[PDB]
Amino acid sequence: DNGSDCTNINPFSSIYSYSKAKIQQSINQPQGTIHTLLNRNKECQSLIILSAANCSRMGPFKSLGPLGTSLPIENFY
Amino acid sequence: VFAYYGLKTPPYKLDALEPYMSQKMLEVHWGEHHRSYVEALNKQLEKNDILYGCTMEELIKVTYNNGNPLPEFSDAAQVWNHDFFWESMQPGGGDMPKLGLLQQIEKDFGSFTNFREKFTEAALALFGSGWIWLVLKREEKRLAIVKTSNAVNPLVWNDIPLIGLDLWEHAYYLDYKNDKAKYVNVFMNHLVSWDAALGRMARAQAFVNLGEPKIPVA
Amino acid sequence: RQELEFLLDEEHYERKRNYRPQYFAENFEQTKQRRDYYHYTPAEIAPLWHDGLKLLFVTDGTLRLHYYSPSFDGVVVGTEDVLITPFTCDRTGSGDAVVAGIMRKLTTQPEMYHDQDVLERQLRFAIAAGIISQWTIGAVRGFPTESATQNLKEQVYVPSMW
Amino acid sequence: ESEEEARRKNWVDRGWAPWEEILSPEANFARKSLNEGEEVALQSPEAIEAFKMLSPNYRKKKISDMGITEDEYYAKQFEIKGEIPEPLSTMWAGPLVVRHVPPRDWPPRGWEVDKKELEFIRETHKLQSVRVDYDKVEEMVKMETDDMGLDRYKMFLKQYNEWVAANKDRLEKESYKYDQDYYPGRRKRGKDYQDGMYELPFYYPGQICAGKVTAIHLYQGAFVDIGGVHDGWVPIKRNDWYWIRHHIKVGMHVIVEILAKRDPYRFRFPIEMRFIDPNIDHLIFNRFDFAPIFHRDEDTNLDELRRDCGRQPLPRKDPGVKVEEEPLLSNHPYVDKLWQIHNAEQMILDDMEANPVKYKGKNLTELTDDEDFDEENRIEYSKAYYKKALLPKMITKVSVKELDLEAAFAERQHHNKLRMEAQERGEVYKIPKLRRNIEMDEYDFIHWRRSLEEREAMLRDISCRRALGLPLEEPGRYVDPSAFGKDQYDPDSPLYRYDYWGEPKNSEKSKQERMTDVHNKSIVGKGTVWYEMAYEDAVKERMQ
Amino acid sequence: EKPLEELYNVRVERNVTKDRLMELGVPRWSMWKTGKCKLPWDWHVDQLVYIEEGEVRVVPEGSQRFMQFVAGDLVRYPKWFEADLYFNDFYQERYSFRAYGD
Ligand SMILES: [Fe+3]
């Protein structure tokens, strides 16, 4: 009877799909950057999440354009 | 609407390799086969704007679609491979690998003789139409040889092709009707541009680094 | 604080306190993720400011105290320890005690309007009064005396601050 | 192993690097003194030097003696130590012959442009495939300007000015909405957006450009501003920076080449470049396998995200069954609804007979049980009534118009007429099948035909693919057979099954007591079955 | 923003002409019909479907969005496609399963 699932929601009547999409995403993600470990890359990998709690900005311590594109060379050798 | 229209002229004259390949064969292979493909490639690209605005490598990789080739994968693949083939051959005989390439061949094959033997074996073993390639693998940082059926080229597996050969019959029948071993032996001994292969390896060295880093003593 | 926010687009400050830096922080406070103690700029309080206003106190519930004057603006740090006596725990008479201490210090010390440090040292008295008033059920029953408030002020704050 | 090999393995795999430790005087004194011992007179020169440096006046005296200023002494602490690389010199292979072609993805998705002008713009694509002899370039150069022909590129510039003047505020609004904070690789907005910048469609992979480095990130890489709302990105990873930091510095002007242009919404860095001018490629060893993307709140299906970002499919455990050799599917999905409406029709038609007065006065074709009847309210669970087993009773309410009662009424009239006729004969009347059951069988038959055609095409597809070497399964979907360990499945291979010491204890799990009990209640005497046969075999024997 | 047909490589030809229907033998294709039901199906091969009468909206596996096709559409389903098809009325189609090539 529950229609929260997208598969359960009928295509002709997508009210259940709209209600499911209206639900906000979870906060499980720590809102950071996924920093992989090369040490554990060969074996089962692990992840480090770098966020605003871990990284801080120190503060104030103290022409340019697409010139062109290269053309093919006749003397390719 | 028309992109990639140009028929790439070859780095050498159509009659430059006359002692070993007639002008006619090259004229037919290029004049007809190459032209045929590009004219259909621009016709297919005119229809779909999404595939229109893509690089040739990116276009090929997208049209491959991870095992299910799109109707535009073929033409593009063929044009690119034929172009590569034209560039991979020089008006001068090549019997020796260049200095950078040699070290790599010794590192993986172990000899130039074993490399040539494996190349000839793979070229003769492939049954039908296709191409054979000498490529550098980004993941393993090693040289290897790949045989691909029909129009497929290594770019689909994120590899850098250094040299390629047409095993489609249209390339060799007029000259040699049914001796593929000769056709190969000729391409290995007299008709191969190792300098172009070394240049492609030097270009790929930016993408894949073939060396060892400097470890500070600390 | 809640009343001042309600009079000053409470939803704006509610969205402000919930702001989190996406990539990296710009200060030490954001790195440690402590409770939000926002000090309102005089520009924000300008719509609620009139000519005849001498002092404006924005209490944060016996935990922070903000003062506003034509010359200077600031914030007095405070603390709450209702948990020390878990069983009684009644906050019913804290704000009344804070207002009473403020009025007492204003009637006794006449330099609070002109001097800022004296103002803060005197508001610490009202903070201590509220802290004492939160430990007893009954607003009229658990009201602090002057001696107890001075004792708590001297015990909580270092000698330099009192 | 040896210390050299271990250090090399650390540098290669774990990312070790001798980063400079900027210690305090007390920390340096602690690191230098602890080597000698505890409560022993310090005799090492560096230990005594640090002990004297623990005082500010000694540091001031040493600064005055060395002659350097205090600002110079502060920077002397932040000095790279160890071997310093030789300064790199730029080398050019030859003359750089360039062109100004319009990008191949100029028309933005959802923007309309003139087709006739679009063809003139795109005509440069076929012209770009003409070789030029680089060695004899200098002989043919003409120093007279104002005669160059760039009409196609100028018309492209006009059309691009139109689009940017149209969509500047829209792009800024979308950037403010989707992105909260500015980061190297994002659209410059607010104060940073000076007019005259080049939009993202203006660029294209293959265009040589020039810019200045604005930010240097350890993990992500170096960012170069090429005069646009989105900066450029050069992938330089963690461990290569220890040696690349002597050649790439903030504020340096470099020449870069665009390798791939992507979408800002789905990628953190839209444009990826390479450093032609510095040529630091000998240095780079750690590469990025896939481009960085944004995992946003709107994304709820991981497969759509993987398809959008071009990454491989989600890994799944590989089933050991072969899709080629498997039983075909004949069951039809509409069969359940057809059966339920058949039952509802039969029930309502039989109940109209029980109440002739109710059936009278109302046409069979037009009938209404309830005006506010809904299929949603019909679905319910009820386990109150249990004769032998208790389970939720799913209720389904067939619609009034859904049932066509005229055909059912005619069928029942004919059937009861033949029933009473056969009773007059003296034999019970029997009917093989009704109309709706035959229709359900036809549905099952057409579904079986569809499945058979699918499998017949699948056999040929297998051959074709195998012949040509093409893969049969989607690459990346079925990857790990056993690779993920510590997976409890009771297969006795990781020794997760109960010990094979007799297995006498079954009361804890998989107890077969209840089954034997209910079998003994149903059949107390478990005698040897004289006749044991399948249900379908018994039905056929009854038929045959 | 990009349509789901582009993501899942679902090629659909809307309002096909009579000459296009004459080609590929659309009249000689096998027929299939349904009422109101949910059909989970996995495409082991490419399938060319000409929906004649009804209307079908297909959702990808695990996706909260749908793709809708009308009676004037010629839809080709890609290989290894896992999706759910829902119908709400009489739906008649002509299906042809094709291997590598045409
Ligand atoms: Fe060819």
mmCIF file of N, CA, C and O in Angstrom, chain D residues 461-496:
data_model
loop_
_atom_site.group_PDB
_atom_site.id
_atom_site.type_symbol
_atom_site.label_atom_id
_atom_site.label_comp_id
_atom_site.label_asym_id
_atom_site.label_seq_id
_atom_site.Cartn_x
_atom_site.Cartn_y
_atom_site.Cartn_z
ATOM 1 N N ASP D 461 22.584 -12.787 -31.135
ATOM 2 C CA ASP D 461 23.393 -11.682 -30.635
ATOM 3 C C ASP D 461 24.632 -12.192 -29.911
ATOM 4 O O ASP D 461 25.729 -11.648 -30.085
ATOM 5 N N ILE D 462 24.466 -13.324 -29.236
ATOM 6 C CA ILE D 462 25.584 -13.932 -28.532
ATOM 7 C C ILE D 462 26.600 -14.290 -29.572
ATOM 8 O O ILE D 462 27.765 -13.947 -29.449
ATOM 9 N N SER D 463 26.158 -14.933 -30.636
ATOM 10 C CA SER D 463 27.115 -15.397 -31.618
ATOM 11 C C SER D 463 27.816 -14.249 -32.255
ATOM 12 O O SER D 463 29.029 -14.232 -32.326
ATOM 13 N N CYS D 464 27.047 -13.289 -32.729
ATOM 14 C CA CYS D 464 27.639 -12.143 -33.364
ATOM 15 C C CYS D 464 28.673 -11.505 -32.471
ATOM 16 O O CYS D 464 29.764 -11.181 -32.928
ATOM 17 N N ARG D 465 28.357 -11.340 -31.191
ATOM 18 C CA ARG D 465 29.259 -10.621 -30.341
ATOM 19 C C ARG D 465 30.476 -11.474 -30.164
ATOM 20 O O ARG D 465 31.586 -10.992 -30.298
ATOM 21 N N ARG D 466 30.284 -12.753 -29.893
ATOM 22 C CA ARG D 466 31.435 -13.595 -29.623
ATOM 23 C C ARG D 466 32.324 -13.677 -30.827
ATOM 24 O O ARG D 466 33.543 -13.668 -30.707
ATOM 25 N N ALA D 467 31.716 -13.764 -31.992
ATOM 26 C CA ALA D 467 32.493 -13.862 -33.200
ATOM 27 C C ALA D 467 33.364 -12.646 -33.316
ATOM 28 O O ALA D 467 34.554 -12.751 -33.589
ATOM 29 N N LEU D 468 32.776 -11.483 -33.106
ATOM 30 C CA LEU D 468 33.512 -10.234 -33.248
ATOM 31 C C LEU D 468 34.226 -9.814 -31.969
ATOM 32 O O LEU D 468 34.790 -8.716 -31.926
ATOM 33 N N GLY D 469 34.200 -10.642 -30.926
ATOM 34 C CA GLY D 469 34.925 -10.360 -29.708
ATOM 35 C C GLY D 469 34.242 -9.406 -28.754
ATOM 36 O O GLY D 469 34.799 -9.122 -27.687
ATOM 37 N N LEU D 470 33.063 -8.898 -29.103
ATOM 38 C CA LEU D 470 32.365 -7.964 -28.240
ATOM 39 C C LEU D 470 31.907 -8.660 -26.960
ATOM 40 O O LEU D 470 31.570 -9.846 -26.971
ATOM 41 N N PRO D 471 31.896 -7.940 -25.838
ATOM 42 C CA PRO D 471 31.535 -8.571 -24.564
ATOM 43 C C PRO D 471 30.047 -8.878 -24.487
ATOM 44 O O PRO D 471 29.214 -8.186 -25.077
ATOM 45 N N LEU D 472 29.720 -9.927 -23.735
ATOM 46 C CA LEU D 472 28.336 -10.346 -23.552
ATOM 47 C C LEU D 472 27.652 -9.663 -22.380
ATOM 48 O O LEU D 472 26.447 -9.402 -22.449
ATOM 49 N N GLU D 473 28.388 -9.363 -21.314
ATOM 50 C CA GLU D 473 27.845 -8.694 -20.142
ATOM 51 C C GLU D 473 28.358 -7.263 -20.089
ATOM 52 O O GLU D 473 29.436 -6.954 -20.608
ATOM 53 N N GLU D 474 27.573 -6.394 -19.463
ATOM 54 C CA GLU D 474 27.980 -5.006 -19.320
ATOM 55 C C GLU D 474 29.260 -4.927 -18.492
ATOM 56 O O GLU D 474 29.296 -5.409 -17.353
ATOM 57 N N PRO D 475 30.329 -4.344 -19.032
ATOM 58 C CA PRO D 475 31.595 -4.292 -18.289
ATOM 59 C C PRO D 475 31.470 -3.420 -17.049
ATOM 60 O O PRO D 475 31.016 -2.275 -17.114
ATOM 61 N N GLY D 476 31.876 -3.977 -15.908
ATOM 62 C CA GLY D 476 31.833 -3.277 -14.647
ATOM 63 C C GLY D 476 30.630 -3.585 -13.781
ATOM 64 O O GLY D 476 30.603 -3.172 -12.615
ATOM 65 N N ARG D 477 29.634 -4.297 -14.310
ATOM 66 C CA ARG D 477 28.447 -4.601 -13.517
ATOM 67 C C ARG D 477 28.681 -5.810 -12.619
ATOM 68 O O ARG D 477 28.419 -5.759 -11.411
ATOM 69 N N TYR D 478 29.171 -6.908 -13.189
ATOM 70 C CA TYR D 478 29.506 -8.116 -12.440
ATOM 71 C C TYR D 478 31.026 -8.215 -12.378
ATOM 72 O O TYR D 478 31.664 -8.620 -13.355
ATOM 73 N N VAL D 479 31.602 -7.856 -11.232
ATOM 74 C CA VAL D 479 33.053 -7.750 -11.120
ATOM 75 C C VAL D 479 33.593 -8.759 -10.120
ATOM 76 O O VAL D 479 34.399 -9.627 -10.475
ATOM 77 N N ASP D 480 33.163 -8.650 -8.870
ATOM 78 C CA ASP D 480 33.792 -9.412 -7.800
ATOM 79 C C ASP D 480 33.046 -10.722 -7.555
ATOM 80 O O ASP D 480 31.888 -10.699 -7.115
ATOM 81 N N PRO D 481 33.660 -11.878 -7.834
ATOM 82 C CA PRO D 481 33.034 -13.151 -7.451
ATOM 83 C C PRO D 481 33.083 -13.393 -5.952
ATOM 84 O O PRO D 481 32.075 -13.753 -5.333
ATOM 85 N N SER D 482 34.258 -13.176 -5.360
ATOM 86 C CA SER D 482 34.500 -13.456 -3.950
ATOM 87 C C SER D 482 35.337 -12.356 -3.310
ATOM 88 O O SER D 482 35.553 -12.369 -2.093
ATOM 89 N N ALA D 483 35.819 -11.423 -4.131
ATOM 90 C CA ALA D 483 36.799 -10.386 -3.760
ATOM 91 C C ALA D 483 36.404 -9.763 -2.421
ATOM 92 O O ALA D 483 37.265 -9.648 -1.534
ATOM 93 N N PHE D 484 35.155 -9.353 -2.224
ATOM 94 C CA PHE D 484 34.755 -8.828 -0.925
ATOM 95 C C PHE D 484 34.627 -9.961 0.089
ATOM 96 O O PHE D 484 33.759 -10.831 -0.020
ATOM 97 N N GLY D 485 35.507 -9.941 1.087
ATOM 98 C CA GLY D 485 35.531 -10.951 2.125
ATOM 99 C C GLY D 485 34.677 -10.577 3.318
ATOM 100 O O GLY D 485 34.032 -9.526 3.354
ATOM 101 N N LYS D 486 34.682 -11.464 4.317
ATOM 102 C CA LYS D 486 33.903 -11.280 5.542
ATOM 103 C C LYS D 486 32.416 -11.099 5.235
ATOM 104 O O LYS D 486 31.719 -10.315 5.882
ATOM 105 N N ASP D 487 31.928 -11.830 4.237
ATOM 106 C CA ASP D 487 30.525 -11.802 3.846
ATOM 107 C C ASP D 487 29.862 -13.085 4.327
ATOM 108 O O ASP D 487 30.149 -14.168 3.805
ATOM 109 N N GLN D 488 28.972 -12.960 5.308
ATOM 110 C CA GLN D 488 28.334 -14.123 5.912
ATOM 111 C C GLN D 488 27.193 -14.604 5.023
ATOM 112 O O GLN D 488 26.178 -13.914 4.875
ATOM 113 N N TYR D 489 27.357 -15.794 4.440
ATOM 114 C CA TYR D 489 26.340 -16.388 3.587
ATOM 115 C C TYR D 489 26.049 -17.848 3.915
ATOM 116 O O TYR D 489 25.232 -18.465 3.223
ATOM 117 N N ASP D 490 26.691 -18.414 4.941
ATOM 118 C CA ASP D 490 26.529 -19.805 5.354
ATOM 119 C C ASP D 490 26.831 -20.758 4.203
ATOM 120 O O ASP D 490 26.059 -21.693 3.949
ATOM 121 N N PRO D 491 27.930 -20.553 3.479
ATOM 122 C CA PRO D 491 28.288 -21.451 2.372
ATOM 123 C C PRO D 491 29.350 -22.488 2.705
ATOM 124 O O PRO D 491 29.703 -23.278 1.821
ATOM 125 N N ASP D 492 29.883 -22.471 3.930
ATOM 126 C CA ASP D 492 30.877 -23.423 4.425
ATOM 127 C C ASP D 492 32.241 -23.199 3.780
ATOM 128 O O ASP D 492 33.216 -23.871 4.134
ATOM 129 N N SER D 493 32.329 -22.262 2.839
ATOM 130 C CA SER D 493 33.631 -21.917 2.276
ATOM 131 C C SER D 493 34.432 -20.989 3.183
ATOM 132 O O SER D 493 35.631 -21.253 3.379
ATOM 133 N N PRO D 494 33.865 -19.909 3.763
ATOM 134 C CA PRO D 494 34.614 -19.161 4.782
ATOM 135 C C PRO D 494 34.438 -19.776 6.159
ATOM 136 O O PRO D 494 34.755 -19.148 7.176
ATOM 137 N N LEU D 495 33.915 -21.006 6.191
ATOM 138 C CA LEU D 495 33.644 -21.733 7.432
ATOM 139 C C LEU D 495 32.612 -20.996 8.283
ATOM 140 O O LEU D 495 32.743 -20.892 9.505
ATOM 141 N N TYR D 496 31.573 -20.483 7.628
ATOM 142 C CA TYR D 496 30.472 -19.804 8.298
ATOM 143 C C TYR D 496 29.335 -20.745 8.664
ATOM 144 O O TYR D 496 28.439 -20.350 9.418
#
